[model samples]
Target: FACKTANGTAIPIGGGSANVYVNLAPVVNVGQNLVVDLSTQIFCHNDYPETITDYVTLQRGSAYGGVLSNFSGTVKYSGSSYPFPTTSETPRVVYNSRTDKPWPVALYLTPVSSAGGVAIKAGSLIAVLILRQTNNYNSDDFQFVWNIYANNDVVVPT
Candidate 1:
């Protein structure tokens, strides 16, 4: 689908699961972080014994330990819908570097308007999302780390 052409075209997201959350600081960045929003992310795509589960769900039995497995991110949306860069730019594609690939979580609506006060609009999609990382913390003292599950193909752009 030509990667759904820039943004605001592919629009058929129908369902399985959706989860998101991020905290406990730094979220493991080897370097930069300019706009990693909603506290910047979570994890939960523990696809069976397929391994590489964010170090077996945050290091319970340990992992291949490079810790940073193929890192990449981006997005943007203003409307008048034309060139919304799917990745390395925006509108959607929340996060993807393989790990079973997933991208959809640019939700918006509810607050109609209010520029200075903060409340805004634009993004309006109630579907798709994916993230994962777990080690079960075998012994406790965890922050609940990351885990988002939503499998669905995408569409939305110029």
Candidate 2:
């Protein structure tokens, strides 16, 4: 998958398991919300339906909660030759500050309705991640890393 800025800057990413740094301070406005787009590509286009799952890790800085709060995710869909799933698993966020551990975000896809069976479009938006900028800051850089289990049919972007 790829992380895209609101202005349409797609950051390069790796699959299996890797890290990508996003410096949002340059284009972000303090006390304003920042939205990031996460999209995936369907490598295979068969009649069989499949579910897309992602185990995402969001490494937040010390300024995360104070400077930016209320981080959330929303799923988006698009029409393509291969019909995309209409329903999506509810996105979730769990945070751990005991050891300053990274936060975890769950993103999954589910079919709301199907006729000819589900087949993902070539380019489908997985989620629209949002972070509310509660306050101002100098440097705001965060790490976005994700992983997938062996059983998932989805492709981990590389």
Candidate 3:
């Protein structure tokens, strides 16, 4: 299902019955460019009700929201190959300014990341994340935030 914000932005809905909710928001003008990355693990369950899988959707709220991408197939787990269950472990989302088009504004996870970081160009607005739970609820977590700087730059106390 797609969720439309008051501003008429379309938010993508993920598949499966996993207790995971994701929401995105614009950090800059619609036409601006930026880069971002998922800072930590966005895990899901791999059992009944919530099948372990890697199907996620990107949406915009209060700004521009739409389906950005969906990942499927097998992902490395522990030391074995487990079907990308409805639940995810160490899920990382990224938006590349040099490769990806139209930058992504936000990402939502049911249980946020514990330790992760994102880097984007200057002048970009801050993004938001929304996580919801399903019947097979899991723990809640948060993602780490980061900033971008020119190469070879150093920080000195004034």
Candidate 4:
């Protein structure tokens, strides 16, 4: 899907992309805190099949080189929004962490108290989260972008 910029300019979110990143000012200091609204950047939509069996993840990258430290962080999805954590329905999660990866996301990650999703959470350095639709996702499908929102939470932290 596509997301609109401040002046209501609808631009492409992720087109034919496998890797998605919601970044901080690019760097987050150890004593500093960073927070990003995963839902506010763009209004997103995903047409679900009746079968209903898909899930996304928030695993830290192993390929990207950086120091790994467990700092306080969170991942929040606005519930009073349009598609995800949709007020009309409940968001479901299959998994929230992975031990096999070089760095785990949950250590510095969290989702909205209600629901929506997660992608990245980081250490005492650069606020980095590499988001890629993980399950049965199309490069052109699901977890796109958002228009706006009211409620809030800290999703990506550093």
Considering every candidate listed, which one attains the maximal TM-score?
4
Worst 10 residues of 4 by lDDT: 98-107
Q: Which portions of model 1 miss their true places by more than 4 Å? A: 1-15, 19-34, 38-40, 50-158
lDDT of each residue in 79-110, candidate 2, tens digit only? 11111121322233322121222222223232
Error of 1 at 149 (Å): 17
Error of 4 at 105 (Å): 10
lDDT of 1 by residue, 15-86 (tens): 122233222122222343213232223222223334322221111111010111122232222221221112
TM-score to true structure, per model: 0.20, 0.23, 0.20, 0.29
lDDT of 4 at 92: 38
lDDT of 4 by residue, 1-158 (tens): 23333234443434222222344433444455444444333322333434333343332222111212223343332222122111232233332232111111221222223322222233322233333343444433334222122122223232
Of 1 and 4, which scores higher on TM-score? 4
lDDT of 3 by residue, 38-112 (tens): 222233322232332222222212111111111122323222333322243333332211221222222321111
How well does model 2 score by local distance difference test?
0.25
Off by over 4 Å in 2: 1-100, 115-118, 133-158
**Considering lDDT, where higher is better, how would the candidates rank from best to worst?**
4, 3, 2, 1
lDDT of each: 0.22, 0.25, 0.25, 0.31
Instruction: Mark the 10 consecutive residues where model 3 has the least summed lDDT.
Output: 62-71
